[PDB]
Amino acid sequence: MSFLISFDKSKKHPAHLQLANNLKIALALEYASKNLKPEVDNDNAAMELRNTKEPFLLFDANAILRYVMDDFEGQTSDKYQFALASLQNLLYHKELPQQHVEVLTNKAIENYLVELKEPLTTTDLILFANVYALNSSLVHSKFPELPSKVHNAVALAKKH
Amino acid sequence: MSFLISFDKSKKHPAHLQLANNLKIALALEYASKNLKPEVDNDNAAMELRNTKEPFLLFDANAILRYVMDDFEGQTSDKYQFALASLQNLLYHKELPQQHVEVLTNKAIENYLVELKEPLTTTDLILFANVYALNSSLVHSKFPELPSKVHNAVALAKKH
Amino acid sequence: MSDLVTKFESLIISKYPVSFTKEQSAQAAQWESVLKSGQIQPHLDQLNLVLRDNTFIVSTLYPTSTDVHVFEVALPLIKDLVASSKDVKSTYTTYRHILRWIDYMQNLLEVSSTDKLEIN
Amino acid sequence: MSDLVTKFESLIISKYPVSFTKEQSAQAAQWESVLKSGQIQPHLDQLNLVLRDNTFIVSTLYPTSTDVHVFEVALPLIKDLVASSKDVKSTYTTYRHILRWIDYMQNLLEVSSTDKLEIN
């Protein structure tokens, strides 16, 4: 029931091959066991059985970045928890409330970000990303020469 | 490298949300680890990361029927091995060589099929299917009243 | 520790070991980010879609702590959506898979009759 | 027992236990039906596609007997396709994933230099 089955119908198989196949497909439908009784598909002319479940995907950018870095470390941090709960929540406003952004980003680069060391962790990068989006002039004055990886990312991301 | 990644680009997210997201996406590209360096997709306006591997599917009718019956029994049979290697091979001819079909199907209902008992196994059904496609008049005379499941399948399969 | 988390950890199902794939690790990170940013409500159709194809949020046979964390905010939202609907059959269809999951979770955590979602 | 099957079972990799899912059971049944019906050759692009996304035929980390059974008929076919090509680079692209698999399998089973596929 997340399965689609179809008949051999077209395909230039010979008529007798279509019959053998379609008798087998019809018999799978009849002898199917209720919990695996597939749905039939009529705009496929080719015979197959296929799982229609969604493939692996992520819609959250933090999760995407952590996945591609295999970096699941530091999610319990105050650093990360502030990133998520104090900064990233602000990004869902239609218009940014600038006075609050100003202190929260200030605070971010006071307590949590000082560095752009590296090796840069996903947690560091997610914090930097959120602060940059909210207050990049504070970033410019904070780190006027950025790690080149971060620099190349920003150069790409900044144009619409 | 069986992964597609895309930017938030459209989406009516606010401009600052697109930026935060797209900085994160750009940073995933830069900090990706060679063995997981995804390909970028430009006709998706929505941000995601997704596995592009094919989903579970079967193209062989015998395998489809066995899967939907969870019946993997008897594949070592002479019954099944004759079905596959003596009958099913004939179905790939552009035109059927009728004299050979005649004896091989005769033999099939001599040695291997006698019954349409049941409970009918996938092996039984796959043998019946192949013989029917090759020589259904021999079947009509062999079993003039078919199990109703098989009967309903045949009724569907016989029309183009 | 909230009342629901405390209840969950009182059950041995909370003790079932599971070694996450990196895919499951990402799914857990994704719902943490949705939770802590306060965006569960706009992501209900996404939750419903995940639960169409997965019994639990992180692609597991057993509820995990992600399920309890998300159910904690999701139950009140869905209950309100249902209580206020002028066509509860359609609402039920729209959120069919979240409602299957809610039913299980509110029974597992023995949620009180005033706080639970009266089901059909 | 063919020479290749006999060789395979002389290696301990043939002894690695694996409990097939019903999906993997179907994949094995599907290639058995393709083999015994004599249709490997028309199903080469299907084999190539399976092997794009799977290291081995039945979605395993280790070669199984299905791999050895199919490699037995597939090696001669692909070798002939390559030996006769007027543009071997394109042939290599068209059958790229089968060639990766062949390379592994002909090394594992220590196929003789006359019978193996001279690789690039």
The CATH number given to whatever domain includes residue D102 is 1.20.1050.10
Nearest CA in chain C to A74: C29
Residues A38 and A83 in one domain: no
In angstroms, what separates the C-alpha of A108 from chain B's closest C-alpha? 16
By residue range, what is the domain housing residue D90?
A: 1-120
Scan residues 101-130 of A and list those with Cβ closer than 8 Å to B.
120, 125-126, 129-130
Cited resolution, angstroms: 2.2
SS3 A58: strand
Instruction: For strands B49-51 and B3-5, give the pairing.
Output: antiparallel
Between CA B134 and CA D37 the distance in angstroms is 15
Contact flag A152-B26 (C-beta cutoff 8 Å): yes
- Strand partners for C112: none
Q: D82 CA to chain B: closest CA distance, Å?
A: 26
Residues A77 and A42 in one domain: no
Helices (H), D1-120: 3-8, 22-36, 44-53, 65-83, 88-94, 96-108
Residues B76/B120, Cβ–Cβ less than 8 Å: no
Provide the number of structural domains found in chain D.
Answer: 1
Sheet holding A49-51, edge to edge: A39-40, A3-5, A49-51, B57-58
**Domain containing A159: what range?**
54-160
Is there a single domain that holds both residue A99 and residue A29?
Answer: no
**Which residues does chain C have within 8 Å of residue A85's beta carbon, measured at their own beta carbons?**
36-38
- A139 vs B contacts (CB less than 8 Å): none
Chains A and C lie in contact, requiring 3 or more CB pairs less than 8 Å apart: yes
Q: Are residues A133 and A65 in the same domain?
A: yes
The H or E element that residue A36 is part of is none
* Cα–Cα separations (whole angstroms), residue D37 to A129, B62, B84, B129, D98: 58, 11, 5, 15, 20
Q: What is the CATH number of the domain that holds A78?
A: 1.20.1050.110
8 Å CB contact between D99 and D65: no
Q: What is the DSSP letter of A38?
A: P
For residues A135 and A78, membership in a common domain is answered with yes
Do B18 and B77 reside in the same domain of the chain?
no
Same domain (yes/no): A136, A70: yes
CA distance D59 to D63: 9
Question: Do A130 and B20 make contact, defined as CB atoms within 8 angstroms?
Answer: yes
CA angle (B7 as vertex; A125, C52 as ends), nearest 5: 100
Strand partners, A40: A5
Q: Is C6 exposed, middle or buried (0-12, 13-18, 19+ CB in 10 A)?
A: exposed
Q: Do chains C and D touch (3 or more CB pairs under 8 A)?
A: no
Number of domains in chain A: 2
Chains near A with 3+ CB pairs less than 8 A apart are B, C
DSSP state of D88: H
Task: Judge whether B73 and B123 are in contact, CB under 8 Å.
Answer: yes
Neighbours of C46 (CB within 10 A): 16
Q: How far apart are CA A65 and CA D93, in angstroms?
A: 32
Could you tell me how many CB contacts below 8 A there are between chain B and chain D? 57
Residue holding tokens 């941000």?
A: B47
Distance from CA of A31 to the nearest CA of C (A): 24
Strands of B49-51's sheet in order across: A57-58, B49-51, B3-5, B39-40
Q: Where would I find the beta strands (DSSP E) of B52-150?
A: 57-58
B54: exposed, middle or buried (C-beta count within 10 Å: 0-12, 13-18, 19+)? middle
Q: Could you say which of C26, C36, C42 has the minimum Cβ distance to residue A63? A: C26
At position B78, the amino acid (one-letter code) is D
Q: How far apart are the first and last CA of chain B?
A: 42
Of C22, C36, C49, the CB nearest to A67: C22
Q: Do D27 and B63 touch (CB under 8 A)?
A: yes
* B41 and B108 together in one domain: no
Pair A110, A156 in one domain: yes
Same domain membership, residue B46 and residue B17? yes
Q: Considering only CB atoms, which residues of chain B are within 8 Å of chain D? A: 2, 53-54, 56, 58-60, 62-64, 66-67, 70, 72, 75, 81, 84-85, 88-89, 91-92
Residues A30 and A65 in one domain: no
Between chains, do A62 and C36 touch, taking CB under 8 Å as contact?
A: no
A52 touches chain B (CB under 8 A): yes
Q: Does A50 touch chain B (CB under 8 A)?
A: yes
Experimental method: X-ray
Residue A69 and residue A120 share a domain: yes
